[PDB]
Design a protein around this ligand. Structure first.
Ligand SMILES: [Mg+2]
Ligand SMILES: [Zn+2]
Lengths: 41, 311, 230, 345
DNA sequence: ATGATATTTT
DNA sequence: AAAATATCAT
């Protein structure tokens, strides 16, 4: 791709190297599990 | 299924036919008709042994018109085997074609330019080539002929003086015969092509054989951070027709909902009336027929267990 | 594309295609050599099941109404399965919805009013006391039927006007709101308004009434089409 | 609230609380802290000391003394002196204090600039209307006899755990839960609070509860249908916002103190569904007849009477008898409870 | 002056 | 989990 760009031709490919790879004790006891955690709204 | 894919396919077919032999067309066409072909399947399709397919695959890989992908397979009742698949990587194939075409044109242009230069000289005995500038410092004391340093023999003029028109004709023929490639490249550059991989190529897959041993799938190892060179790339509608019976039913349900809402916000009994003295807490059918008969008389008078989820 | 793709049926590779032009829509898979061909009509199919996306292997199983019949298809690429699965879900749900619905199942001139025999019968059937008097005064009494309506013109005219008047034109389609699954309600008056205001829908409807498919399926297709949007 | 209603950015906001001692490094900004951290004099950690020194270092332009009804306390008065601010503003809803220290505010912060009528705002629709009530719960004979002999400090636990009161609390919660109304049951007595909660299978909050758990219960109770009612303690009496709560009960309460009564009532005066037509929030006060609780309750609602609220006496709760299940219905259950409560002291 | 309850720190 | 200091009411 670099050589093609230098020559003035638009390259259809790119260099692969440029690619990117990607608490305290709870006192409330008896009712610890029934309730779900509504952290946000 | 954009036309760009067809244009690229035409470019590959023309390039292979014009710049490669016959068996090359067979191999590349098969992987163009079928997005991905296993090595075993390709051999069966073209009925060519491994040795014959060797040069074809190797040469096409060198020019990058084809790409290879090796993955381990685990057949249910056979030893694990490393399978080979071939598929076309369009961005690389187009780039390789573009550069190669430019080099060929440039090489011919350089050859044409060089031919116009003065011929030169060469020694008949030792076959050593002397340039015009280099030979001008070798002429004998008599200023008659150029003498070779190694052989001490008169030099002989070089050929290719009359080939000036021949190179121009060669360049003209190439450009005339290469016009489709230039036109196809221009169209390709106008649009954009997404990079192709083995997984993507499998989408446009047409199975070659009924019971091909190779599994045309892709199941990368879970949580595998290993990276290999050249292995990465950049509602339903429900309709309910409402009739008179349904319309009144909907009205009744709406009335019931309103009644429930009203009762919800009503004040309790103890908040309405002062509670002091209360104990402390601690036939017509026949008529219709005769009418119908009578009216009828009138008108006459006037006239395998696996994990699954619901979907 | 969505219509066609690669799949393996009964441990045999082949091409799986969806045909919606022919009613009812059917799914046909043919082997590479063509010696093996299988066709399943989506009308019979009832429930569709797919393997979880987490699982490496990809398959789709269709079970129809009755030892229930089952049809299992295996795909190579996950993207093709999603497109095929989505299209199958739309048709399966649409056909199921149709089955659910099926399981549920001048003129005002005084002279013309007297001459309008059909109107007289309709009024007499609706009213009881008037019918009772008419029977007494025209069956046994023998009084001419025509003379009876001479003195009851205003009542006859009012009855006629109770069904000879129509609401004014309005943007019927703008009132329809779909309100994933969404329920949109229609009424017979609503259907008539759509036909009157938009002749194209009437032309599309008249062709498909008994022939292409049952009426309910038409509206489901129409509201999901680009013609409705336009 | 500050973030939701102004243009300030996090760069200028820092909270000097127990959870985190983050301090703002910007040229200027908002610093929100608590009275205990600032007022503490003897023992404060070095990490907190540096932030406290930062607070005392720069001169401030404005200081807001939220809940200014506790400033006249013995030690909280030091906050005004330590922090140097030109303008100091106090904001409170109940300017009431049992001792004669309430008047001291006039020379610690400033004069009472403005006041608003509770009734006036209720008509305008800004604070939800509340129909206060004071349920009279008679004490049964077996329970009452033990009340007379016991000493004063032990006296409190006899009437707070009155079986008749327990039935009244259960009936009111059940009746108002049917109407889809969130109910908050305050109880100053921790032991009674836990006993009621465990029997009713409902949550509770008080000092032992950690900050994370307390916040989780508050957020959950606001946005979950199943958890319609939660008990509380003295921690939640003042300075907490929760629009969902509409009803409210108090099985037990601190000694006669108008501040807590008004603050607890205010917990349900900001209900979001206050503008809906024909809506009335509820405020229930369960007391035991012939006990000292009656004396305190009358003295504990004086402030509400002055502001305009009127208390209605409910001698009989209609529909209680038909309830299929009532706690401590059998005499044996009452005797077992009496022994259990007596074993406490 | 004492007892509850709450909060902060180590 | 145990200490220590405030606060609110008798
Ligand atoms: Mg506040
Ligand atoms: Zn030589």
């Amino acid at each position: 791709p670099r050589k093609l760009q230098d020559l003035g031709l638009k390259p259809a490919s790119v260099d692969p190297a440029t690619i990117k790879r990607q608490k305290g004790k709870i006192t409330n006891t008896h009712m610890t599990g029934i309730l779900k955690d509504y952290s946000h709204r | 299924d954009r036309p760009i894919d067809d244009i690229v396919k035409n470019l590959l077919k023309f390039v292979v036919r014009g710049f490669y032999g016959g068996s090359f067309v067979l191999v590349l066409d098969a992987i163009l008709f079928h997005s991905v072909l296993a090595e075993d399947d390709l051999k069966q399709l073209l009925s060519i042994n491994k040795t014959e397919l060797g040069p074809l695959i190797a040469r096409l890989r060198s020019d990058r018109l084809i790409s290879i992908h090796k993955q381990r397979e685990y057949p249910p009742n056979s030893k694990s085997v490393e399978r080979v698949y071939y598929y076309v990587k369009y961005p690389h194939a187009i780039d390789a074609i573009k550069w190669k075409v430019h080099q060929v044109v440039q090489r011919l242009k350089d050859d044409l330019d060089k031919n116009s230069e003065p011929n030169g000289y060469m020694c008949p005995i030792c076959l050593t080539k002397y340039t015009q500038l280099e030979a001008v410092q070798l002429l004998n004391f008599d200023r008659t002929e150029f003498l070779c340093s190694l052989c001490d023999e008169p030099l002989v003029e070089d050929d290719s003086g009359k080939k000036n028109k021949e190179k121009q004709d060669k360049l003209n023929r190439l450009m005339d015969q290469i016009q489709p490639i230039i036109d196809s490249l221009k169209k390709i550059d106008d649009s954009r092509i997404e990079e192709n991989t083995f997984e993507i190529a499998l989408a446009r897959l047409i199975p070659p054989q009924n019971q091909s041993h190779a599994a045309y799938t892709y199941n990368p190892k879970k949580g595998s951070t290993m990276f290999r060179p050249g292995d990465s790339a950049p509602a339903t509608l429900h309709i309910n027709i409402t009739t008179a019976s349904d319309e009144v039913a909907q009205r009744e349900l709406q009335e019931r909902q309103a009644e429930e809402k009203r009762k919800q916000n009503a004040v309790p009994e103890w908040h309405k009336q002062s509670t002091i003295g209360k104990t402390a807490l601690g036939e017509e059918r026949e008529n219709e027929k005769t009418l119908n008969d009578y009216y009828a008389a009138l008108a006459k008078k006037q006239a395998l267990e696996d994990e699954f989820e619901d979907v | 594309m969505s219509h066609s793709g690669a799949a393996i049926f009964e441990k045999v590779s082949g091409i799986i295609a969806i045909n919606e032009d022919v009613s009812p829509a059917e799914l046909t898979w043919r082997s590479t050599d063509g010696d093996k061909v299988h066709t399943v009509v989506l009308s019979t199919i009832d429930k569709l099941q797919a393997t979880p996306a987490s699982s490496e292997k990809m398959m789709l199983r269709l079970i129809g109404k009755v030892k229930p019949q089952r049809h299992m298809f295996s795909f190579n690429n996950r993207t093709v399965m999603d497109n095929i699965k989505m299209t199958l879900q739309q048709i399966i749900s649409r056909y199921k919805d149709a089955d659910i619905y099926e399981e549920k199942r001048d003129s005002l001139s005084k002279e013309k009013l007297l001459t309008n025999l059909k109107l007289q019968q309709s009024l007499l059937k609706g009213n009881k006391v008037l019918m009772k008097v008419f029977q007494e005064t025209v069956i046994n009494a023998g009084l001419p039927p025509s003379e009876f309506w001479s003195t009851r013109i205003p009542l006859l005219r009012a009855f006629a006007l109770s069904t000879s008047q129509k609401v004014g034109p309005y943007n019927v389609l703008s009132t329809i709101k779909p309100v994933n699954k969404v329920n949109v309600n229609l009424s017979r008056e609503k259907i008539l308004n759509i036909f009157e205001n938009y002749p194209i829908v009437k032309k599309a409807y008249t062709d498909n009434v008994p022939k292409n498919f049952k009426e309910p399926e038409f509206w489901a297709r129409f509201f999901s089409s680009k013609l409705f949007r336009k | 609230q500050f973030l939701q209603w102004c243009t300030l950015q996090p760069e200028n906001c820092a909270v000097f609380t127990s959870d985190n001692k983050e301090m703002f490094q910007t040229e200027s900004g908002l610093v929100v802290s608590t009275y205990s951290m600032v007022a503490n004099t003897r023992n404060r950690s070095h990490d907190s000391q540096k932030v406290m020194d930062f607070l005392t270092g720069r001169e401030w332009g404005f200081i807001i003394l939220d809940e200014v009804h506790v400033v006249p306390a013995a030690m909280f008065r030091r906050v005004v002196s330590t922090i140097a601010a030109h303008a100091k503003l106090g904001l409170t809803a109940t300017l009431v204090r049992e001792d004669d220290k309430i008047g001291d505010l006039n020379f610690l912060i400033g004069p009472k600039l403005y006041e608003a009528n509770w009734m006036e705002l209720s008509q305008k629709g800004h604070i939800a209307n509340v129909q206060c009530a004071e349920v009279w719960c008679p004490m049964t004979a077996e329970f009452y006899q033990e009340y007379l002999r016991e000493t004063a400090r032990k006296r409190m636990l006899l009437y707070i755990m009155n079986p008749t009161k327990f039935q009244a609390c259960q009936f009111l919660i059940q009746y108002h839960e049917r109407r889809g109304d969130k109910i908050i049951v305050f109880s100053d007595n921790v032991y009674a609070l836990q006993e009621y909660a465990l029997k009713m299978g409902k949550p509770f909050i008080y000092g032992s509860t950690p900050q994370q758990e307390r916040m989780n219960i508050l957020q959950n109770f606001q946005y979950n249908d199943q958890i319609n009612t939660i008990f509380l303690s003295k921690v939640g009496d003042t300075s907490i916002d929760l629009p969902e709560a509409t009803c409210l009960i108090q099985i037990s309460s601190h000694y006669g103190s108008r501040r807590q009564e008004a603050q607890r009532l205010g917990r349900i005066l900001r209900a979001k569904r206050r503008n809906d037509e024909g809506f009335n929030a509820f405020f229930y006060s369960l007391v035991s007849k012939d006990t000292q609780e009656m004396y305190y309750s009358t003295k504990r609602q004086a402030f509400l009477v002055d502001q305009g609220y009127a208390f209605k006496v409910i001698t009989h709760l209609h529909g209680m008898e038909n309830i299929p299940n009532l706690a401590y219905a059998s005499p044996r259950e009452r005797r077992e409870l009496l022994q259990e409560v007596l074993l406490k002291n």
